[PDB]
Design a protein around this ligand. Structure first.
Ligand SMILES: CCCCCCCCCCCCCCCCCC(=O)OC[C@H](COP(=O)([O-])OCC(O)COP(=O)([O-])OC[C@@H](COC(=O)CCCCCCCCCCCCCCCCC)OC(=O)CCCCCCCCCCCCCCCCC)OC(=O)CCCCCCCCCCCCCCCCC
Ligand SMILES: COC1=C(OC)C(=O)C(C/C=C(\C)CC/C=C(\C)CC/C=C(\C)CC/C=C(/C)CC/C=C(\C)CC/C=C(\C)CC/C=C(\C)CC/C=C(/C)CCC=C(C)C)=C(C)C1=O
Ligand SMILES: CCCCCCCCCCCCCCCCCC(=O)OC[C@H](COP(=O)([O-])OCC[N+](C)(C)C)OC(=O)CCCCCCCCCCCCCCCCC
Ligand SMILES: CCCCCCCCCCCCCCCCCC(=O)OC[C@H](COP(=O)([O-])OCC[N+](C)(C)C)OC(=O)CCCCCCCCCCCCCCCCC
Ligand SMILES: CCCCCCCCCCCCCCCCCC(=O)OC[C@H](COP(=O)(O)OCCN)OC(=O)CCCCCCCCCCCCCCCCC
Ligand SMILES: CCCCCCCCCCCCCCCCCC(=O)OC[C@H](COP(=O)(O)OCCN)OC(=O)CCCCCCCCCCCCCCCCC
Ligand SMILES: CCCCCCCCCCCCCCCCCC(=O)OC[C@H](COP(=O)(O)OCCN)OC(=O)CCCCCCCCCCCCCCCCC
Ligand SMILES: COC1=C(OC)C(=O)C(CC=C(C)C)=C(C)C1=O
Ligand code: SF4
Ligand code: SF4
Lengths: 56, 178, 96, 67, 79, 157, 385, 92, 317
């Protein structure tokens, strides 16, 4: 991006595609770092009852 | 569900118009010119390369990088020589021998990670109960001599002290996940 | 149009101090780009960020002139960056 | 950005015009401000030589109606 | 004819190749200018035209180049 | 400055700069480390920028990067290619498979390091040594090539 | 016949290949490929290593399709333990499995062109490949050689930003395939170099055990992903790109289609990934969570034993095949009751394909052989093992 | 002479390079196809010769004979080519 | 003064040779989403000089089995012929104008095929001999159409002297007429400089042949030769078919436009290289003998007929 319109137009044409819509270089669209803290889910078998291993 | 690639559904019988279009394709290299347009197009796109020393390719917290041994905030090295980091190392890299320190505490007399043997799996990071051995962020530790790559407890503890601030931040970010 | 790009170019060139500064950057960092100093570590390295540029090149470090004695004017190596600021540079943490 | 390729092209170009301007002014200096006569066929060499004999030793010097 | 067609679309060089071979073998035969080539080149005067003695028995030869007699290239002019 | 010593220091600085700026590497292409460099040759971390040739035949190669395990069947070859490289020549051992045996150290078919077969100048660590990490290693070769003082040694020899 | 060997250092030899060629003039009459230059002893080393500490080895057999390789060991060991991965983990393995087939195909299509002489397609896609590794590194910590897919379930949950970033990559990736699509699919020069080269007939392909895009390219309709659906390949919809004739072009076109079909599968996985746990909840098979091992005795005992000794999978033997990007990758794991395996025969799609080179490269020039190896997508790690 | 001056500088420049280059640092591959090509090449190379004077021959007063001759030469060689194609020649 | 002129033609051309290499390593780069060499010097300007010095310093290796003359004659011949062919070129004024100028360029090019033959025999290793034999064949084949394409041109120019075309192309480029051959001159110029679409002479994936045993100084000289040629042939396209505007009063606008057209067509073969895969050895000869030679021979006859029946026979001299 950050390309003068004319270069973009030349780009889009020479390529035959609207390459601007889907640029390869990433700009402020990528997930920000330090995404929020994760509280992951505990799966089955964590029941404190009727959880006999012999049955699983 | 299948899909035919390169299967001509039917025999389009040549029509002069069709023939001309084709003959022009062979005679005036029309498709070849199409290919040149694509490369000219990128010539105008911004290059994706990074100044390597000045800018660095992004690595998130789980990057394994270079081994380090951490210490408790008080200053007591975390490792208590349970030696299962040695047990689960796939490459036989970590060698640990221990004896009860004078304090009476359990500690490792010798902890040697052979980095040339290590394949940076990150299981040691996984296995440690006190999480004393961690995969530190640094990946730039290329060395002139083979011996430098072999690491004893003092290099790893020193590596741990140097990168402790970032190691602590990285473990802080990823521990909920683990 | 074209004038605009030339204009921003002037900004960049005139931005890194006088010609002395530009040459300092032009020849050792090989990039005349202006950003916002996000901080200066005790070693001397100066870190900058330009969120407008692509992910790969929004955060850069202009290393010091001398680190731990060694002259680092031209012999700049990555490890010069301090461990604290290493993760900021590698985008491990979005916080300076 | 592509403009960085220009510095190199410029140096090539400057180095491809020099030759054409150089050869075409080291001729107009050595031949007295008049393009070096191209003697494709003998007649021309004759006329050229004739010129030499007509004046000085060099053909570029050119005598006129006032002689 | 049908092959001709495919030939126009497959192996479309030879077709063009031969076509030209022929068109060059025809245009010369039929053209309003072909004759000029042998004239225009004939006329171009390369070797000095030596003058003949005047027995005085020749009314065809012009006694002077600019005379109204002799050959002319007005055909070359306004060609 | 004026001293036969100063002229001989400046001229190697010149000779060292030429070798440093243009290192044409030759990658054998063993195992997977070759991929982690095909990424260095690729656009995120161009190597050409630094003056590195993506593909160079042995006779025209300054640096050999041994990426991947050197089995006991490829050893006899590596040495040949190292031996046939032009004299000024340097080796960068990439991967715990090459600098040391890495996983596969104790195998009967793997040489425990290329250092056993070819003298090694920089050892780049990591199972897939990261591509910046190789780029740091290549840059470390450039720091080693700057320090060399061949002309100075001939003068005071 | 002027015997000439395609020596290892040559770039077209994938680093290790000594094709003893007999050149009847420039036409090559016989090839005797001498592999073995990268035999590391991968399957004799595994016998001495516990089931978890042998996972890493499977990321290095085919080194361009790491996770799909480690999904074959993970499925095998899981079968022998009669345990199944949790629902979220199975989607994550299918999500990472198709990122790997896009990654292998970008490897195979672009490096084939590098061999033929087209250099730009490699650079455009390789930037798209580091975008992808980042996804490996952000989920496992290793750009390649992750060790993420574990014998039971996967190792750690996806970071909280990965699925958005995989959408942004998949959203724009197809234009990138479209772009090399224009630059290397109709060029008369490519077609001439690739079309009608190394044709393999349908029955010959089955007899030579080709089992891959090489099987599908000649029109045989076989995908282990739809025929024998492993993991969740029963809940995702895709079209196998069967080619018609078998020339190296039809095989290229199939590889480009599978990249497109994988984007269709990746889309479904992001759209339908279930909330849940990433590893089976049996502490006997998958290691206990970090907080649990540090607060509950049953968990420390289970962590200590699993890391130090192992799963101790019940005695038996299984051959589990998954559709790795190259072709059918299968592990015949024979197991005694011990925590470490007894035998692990890695079937490599590639040992069969390289055998076919002599038959496929028949009546062909020195240059055709470079295309023939390129269209088998052979990585010598899998062949040499 | 002017050419001689230029050329000897040209050789000198190249010999200088190789000399510094060497001084500063201080069995049966045969396919008739290949031979056949070389031959064809000269048959064509000779023809190129019989065709080279055509720029001077254009100005020939005859013209008719010129073209009649030149067209016959080009056509008979091309037929030679034609038979080369028809025969296994040119089919490597 | 003549020497001054000799220097003005050779030195600049050689420097241009060097920077073409740099330009080839940046235009190919940006097309492939990469900056190319910018770190050595400012924007990579010092990059060509840097490897030149590295190449000359590295030890020239004389293979145990190698002639020592057919080995050192080969790069000297390659540089000598290529730099020599710049001697008689109209820009607009030629240093040494020769009445039979185009025959000089055709003959001098033809001699370079030997260097390939001599280097291949000298190396005494199989890769070299196989590469040389195919190479000589490519070069020679692309000479037969290359020559006929010029003969068609000359007949519409009237003479063999390259200086005449500046007067032939005072109203229109010879591309408009004769475009069909330009293309065929351009493709043949791509073959004779062993550039990409036709780089089988030295295929890398195929026989990593010409410089297999050539390193350091010998590598450089051919090397230099190839690139100078790359320019020269492009420059011949920019005189014979794209005729730069000539004004007798100011001779440099001829050279200014010669500069512009030569750089763009030199840029084009750089652009061709990145854009196309390399053709097969027989696919290459299949093109010339089957696709182009019949087109050229027939269009050759059309160019002996166009003059006569269009009463346009060109003026000699
Ligand atoms: C030559 C004439 C000028 C060419 C030119 O200006 O191109 C850029 C200009 C903008 O192109 P772009 O791709 O949009 O540039 C990316 C950013 O928009 C603009 O890039 P930016 O945002 O980085 O803008 C700052 C940039 C602005 O720099 C420029 O745009 C001017 C560059 C002039 C090069 C000459 O200045 C710099 O970053 C430092 C480099 C300056 C030029 C370095 C090379 C100079 C070579 C001198 C000898 C040749 O090109 C055009 O306006 C259309 C050209 C169409 C050609 C067909
Ligand atoms: C496998 O062999 C190899 C090749 O052949 C295919 C290469 O092309 C390449 C690629 C090389 C390049 C494109 C860059 C090399 C460029 C040069 C040597 C040109 C440098 C310029 C000069 C020689 C200076 C100009 C002339 C002078 C000597 C003085 C000027 C007056 C490599 C690396 C290689 O190893
Ligand atoms: C400004 C820079 C312009 C660059 C132009 C080329 C790159 C952009 C191409 C964009 C594109 O994809 O379209 C191609 C298009 C794409 O077409 P296509 O191949 O998809 O199909 C259209 C043609 N039919 C339908 C009949 C098959 O190709 C063409 O339009 C035909 C090109 C013919 C070229 C003939 C050879 C070149 C010309 C030789 C004569 C000399 C001309 C002047 C030379 C220079 C003189 C100074
Ligand atoms: C003419 C042929 C080339 C002769 C030398 C040309 C100039 C060399 C040069 O400028 O070196 C810059 C180089 C620049 O590279 P560098 O060695 O300072 O390190 C580069 C640092 N980064 C990565 C930040 C770019 O500096 C030197 O080489 C210093 C010694 C030069 C000695 C020259 C005189 C002898
Ligand atoms: C002067 C030079 C003239 C050309 C000299 C060389 C000519 C060589 C011709 C050989 C033809 C036979 C042949 O071998 O080619 C058949 C062609 C397939 O060729 P290919 O696949 O390359 O294999 C070659 C070996 N079979 O497959 C073919 O059948 C090609 C058929 C070509 C002819 C098609 C018709 C051409 C004439 C069309 C006329 C249209 C109207 C023209 C009007 C002109 C008016 C003046
Ligand atoms: C290296 C080997 C190749 C050397 C480079 C190639 C040189 C090719 C020369 C071809 C002939 C040049 C020519 O014919 O020009 C003749 C010149 C002017 O003559 P003309 O065109 O008729 O003009 C007259 C009215 N103006 O006036 C002349 O008479 C020039 C006479 C010949 C000049 C030759 C210059 C030296 C070239 C030979 C060098 C020999 C040493 C190297 C030997 C290599 C052996 C392999
Ligand atoms: C009266 C005349 C009517 C119209 C006549 C048109 C004549 C066209 C002149 C060239 C003819 C070339 C040709 O016929 O095609 C040969 C080949 C493609 O042919 P192919 O598909 O192999 O056909 C197989 C049949 N045996 O063609 C090729 O292989 C081309 C390979 C090209 C590789 C590089 C391509 C670069 C293209 C861009 C640059 C084009 C030139 C532009 C500049 C010209 C000078 C300014
Ligand atoms: C993609 O397949 C392969 C290549 O060819 C394109 C190789 O070049 C190589 C090695 C190549 C070099 C010289 C880096 C490997 C390992 C490979 O797997
Ligand atoms: S596991 Fe952690 S603590 Fe136990 S020994 Fe290895 S390092 Fe020290
Ligand atoms: S080191 Fe790690 S990555 Fe490099 S080869 Fe050996 S295993 Fe593969």
């Amino acid at each position: 991006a950050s390309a003068t319109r004319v270069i973009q137009k030349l780009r889009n044409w020479a390529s035959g595609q609207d390459l601007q819509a889907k640029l390869q270089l990433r700009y402020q669209e990528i997930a920000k770092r330090t995404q929020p803290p994760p509280k992951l889910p505990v799966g089955p078998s964590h029941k404190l009852s009727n959880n006999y291993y012999c049955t699983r | 569900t299948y899909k035919y690639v390169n299967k001509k559904e039917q025999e389009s019988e040549v029509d002069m118009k069709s023939a001309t279009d084709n003959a022009a394709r062979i005679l005036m290299w029309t498709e070849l010119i199409r290919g040149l347009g694509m490369t000219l197009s990128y010539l105008f796109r911004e290059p994706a390369t990074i100044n390597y020393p000045f800018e660095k390719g992004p690595l998130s917290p789980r990057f394994r990088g270079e081994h380090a041994l951490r210490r408790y905030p008080s200053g007591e090295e975390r490792c208590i020589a349970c030696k299962l980091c040695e047990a689960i190392c796939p490459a036989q890299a970590i060698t640990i021998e221990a004896e009860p320190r004078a304090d009476g505490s359990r500690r490792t007399t010798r902890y040697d990670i052979d980095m040339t043997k290590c394949i940076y799996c990150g299981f040691c990071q996984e296995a440690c109960p006190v999480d004393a051995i961690v995969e530190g962020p640094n990946f730039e530790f290329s060395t002139e001599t083979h011996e430098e790559l072999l690491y004893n407890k003092e290099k790893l503890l020193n590596n741990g002290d140097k990168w402790e601030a970032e190691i602590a931040a990285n473990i802080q970010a990823d521990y909920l996940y683990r | 149009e074209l004038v605009e790009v030339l204009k921003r170019g002037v900004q960049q060139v005139t931005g890194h101090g006088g010609l002395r500064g530009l040459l300092r950057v032009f020849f050792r960092a090989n990039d005349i780009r202006i950003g916002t100093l996000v901080g200066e570590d005790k070693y001397g390295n100066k870190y900058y960020e330009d969120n407008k540029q692509f992910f790969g090149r929004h955060r850069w470090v202009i290393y010091t002139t001398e680190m731990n004695g060694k002259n680092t004017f031209w012999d700049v190596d990555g490890s010069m960056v301090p461990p604290e600021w290493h993760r900021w540079l590698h985008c491990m943490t979005d916080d300076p | 950005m592509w403009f960085e390729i220009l510095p190199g092209l410029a140096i090539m170009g400057v180095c491809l015009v020099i030759p054409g301007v150089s050869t075409a002014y080291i001729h107009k200096f050595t031949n007295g401000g008049k393009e070096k006569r191209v003697a494709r066929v003998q007649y021309q060499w004759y006329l050229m030589e004739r010129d030499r004999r007509i004046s000085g030793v060099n053909r570029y010097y050119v005598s006129k109606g006032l002689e | 004819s049908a092959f001709l067609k495919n030939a126009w679309a497959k192996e479309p060089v030879l077709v063009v190749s031969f076509s030209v071979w022929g068109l060059a073998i025809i245009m010369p035969m039929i053209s309003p200018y072909t004759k000029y080539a042998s004239m225009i080149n004939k006329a171009t005067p390369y070797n000095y035209p030596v003058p003949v003695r005047d027995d005085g028995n020749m009314p065809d030869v012009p006694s002077h180049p600019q005379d109204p007699l002799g050959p002319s290239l007005d055909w070359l002019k306004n060609l | 400055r004026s001293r036969a010593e100063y002229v001989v220091t400046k001229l190697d600085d010149l000779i060292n700069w030429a070798r440093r700026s243009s290192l044409w590497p030759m990658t054998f292409g063993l195992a997977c480390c070759a991929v982690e460099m095909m990424h260095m040759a690729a656009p995120r971390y161009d190597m050409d920028r630094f003056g590195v040739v993506f593909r160079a035949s042995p006779r025209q190669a300054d640096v050999m990067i041994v990426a991947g395990t050197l089995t006991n069947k490829m050893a006899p070859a590596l040495r040949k290619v190292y031996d046939q490289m032009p004299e000024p020549r340097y080796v960068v051992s990439m991967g715990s498979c090459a600098n040391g045996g890495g996983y596969y150290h104790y195998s009967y078919s793997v040489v425990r390091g290329c250092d056993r077969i070819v003298p090694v100048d920089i050892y780049v660590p990591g199972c897939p040594p990261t591509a910046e990490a190789l780029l740091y290693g290549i840059l470390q070769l450039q720091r080693k090539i700057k320090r060399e003082q061949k002309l100075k040694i001939w003068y005071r020899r | 016949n002027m015997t000439l060997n395609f020596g290892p250092q040559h770039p077209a030899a994938h680093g290790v290949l000594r094709l003893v060629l007999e050149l009847s003039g420039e036409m090559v009459r016989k090839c005797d490929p001498h592999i073995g230059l990268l035999h590391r002893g991968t399957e004799k080393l595994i016998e001495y290593k516990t089931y978890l500490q042998a996972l890493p080895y499977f990321d290095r057999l085919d080194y361009v399709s790491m996770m799909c390789n480690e999904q074959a060991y993970s499925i095998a060991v899981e079968k022998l333990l009669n345990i199944q991965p949790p629902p979220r983990a199975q989607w994550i393995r299918v999500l990472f499995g198709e990122i790997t087939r896009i990654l292998n195909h970008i490897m195979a299509v672009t490096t084939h062109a590098l061999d033929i002489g087209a250099m730009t397609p490699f650079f455009w896609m390789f930037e798209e490949r580091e975008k992808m590794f980042e996804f490996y590194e952000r989920v496992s910590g290793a750009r390649m050689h992750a060790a993420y897919i574990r014998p039971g379930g996967v190792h750690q949950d996806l970071p909280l930003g990965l699925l958005d970033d995989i959408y942004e990559f998949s959203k724009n990736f197809s234009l990138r395939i479209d772009e090399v699509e224009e630059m290397l699919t109709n060029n008369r020069i490519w077609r001439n170099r690739t079309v009608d080269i190394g044709v393999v007939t349908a029955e010959d392909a089955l007899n030579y055990g080709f089992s891959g895009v090489m099987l599908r390219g000649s029109g045989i309709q076989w995908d282990l992903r739809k025929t024998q659906p492993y993991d969740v390949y029963d809940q995702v919809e895709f079209d196998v790109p069967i080619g018609s004739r078998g020339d190296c072009y039809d095989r290229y076109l199939c590889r480009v289609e599978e990249m497109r079909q994988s984007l269709r599968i990746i889309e479904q996985c992001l759209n339908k990934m279930p909330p849940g746990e990433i590893k089976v909840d049996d502490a006997k098979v998958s290691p206990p969570k970090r907080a649990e091992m540090k607060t509950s005795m049953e968990s420390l005992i289970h962590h200590f034993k699993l890391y130090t000794e192992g799963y101790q999978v019940p005695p038996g033997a299984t051959y589990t095949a998954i559709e790795a990007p190259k072709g059918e990758f299968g592990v015949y794991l024979v197991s005694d009751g011990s925590s470490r395996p007894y035998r692990c025969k890695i079937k490599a799609p590639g040992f069969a394909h390289l055998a076919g080179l002599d038959k496929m490269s028949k009546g062909h020039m020195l240059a055709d052989v470079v295309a023939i190896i390129g269209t088998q997508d052979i990585v010598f790690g899998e062949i040499d093992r | 002479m002017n050419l001689y001056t230029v050329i000897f500088i040209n050789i000198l420049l190249s010999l200088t390079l190789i000399l510094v280059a060497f001084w500063l640092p201080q069995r049966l591959p045969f396919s008739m196809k290949f031979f056949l090509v070389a031959i064809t090449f000269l048959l064509f190379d000779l023809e190129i010769a019989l065709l080279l004077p055509l720029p001077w021959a254009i100005q020939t007063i005859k013209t008719s004979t010129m073209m009649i001759m030149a067209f016959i030469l080009v056509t008979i060689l091309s037929l030679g080519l034609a038979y080369e194609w028809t025969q296994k020649g040119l089919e490597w | 003064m003549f020497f001054i002129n000799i220097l003005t033609l050779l030195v600049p051309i050689l420097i241009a040779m060097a920077f073409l290499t740099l330009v080839e390593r940046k235009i190919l780069g940006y097309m492939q989403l990469r900056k190319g060499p910018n770190i050595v010097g400012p924007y990579g300007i010092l990059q060509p000089f840097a490897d030149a010095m590295k190449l000359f310093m590295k030890e020239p290796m004389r293979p145990l089995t190698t002639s020592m003359s057919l080995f050192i004659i080969a790069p000297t011949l390659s540089l000598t012929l290529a730099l020599s062919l710049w001697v008689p070129l109209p820009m607009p004024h030629p240093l040494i104008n020769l009445n039979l100028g185009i025959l000089f360029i055709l003959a001098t090019s033809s001699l370079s095929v030997y260097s390939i033959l001599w280097s291949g025999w000298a190396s005494n290793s199989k890769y070299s001999l196989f590469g040389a034999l195919r190479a000589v064949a490519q070069t020679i084949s692309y000479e037969v159409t290359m020559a006929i394409i010029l003969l068609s041109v000359l007949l519409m120019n009237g003479s063999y002297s390259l200086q005449t075309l500046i007067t032939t192309q005072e109203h229109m480029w010879l591309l408009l007429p004769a475009w069909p051959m330009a293309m065929m001159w351009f493709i043949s110029t791509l073959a004779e400089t062993n550039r990409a679409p036709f780089d089988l002479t030295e295929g890398e994936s195929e026989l990593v042949g010409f410089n297999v045993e050539y390193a350091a100084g010998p590598f450089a000289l051919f090397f230099m030769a190839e690139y100078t040629n790359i320019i020269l042939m492009n420059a011949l396209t920019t005189i014979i078919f794209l005729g730069p505007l000539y004004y007798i009063n100011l001779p440099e606008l001829y050279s200014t436009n010669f500069m512009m057209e030569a750089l763009l067509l030199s840029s084009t073969f750089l652009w061709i290289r990145a854009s196309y895969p390399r053709f097969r050895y027989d696919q290459l000869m299949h093109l010339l003998w089957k696709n182009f030679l019949p087109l050229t021979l027939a269009l050759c006859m059309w160019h002996i007929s166009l003059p006569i029946f269009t009463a346009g026979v060109p003026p000699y001299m």
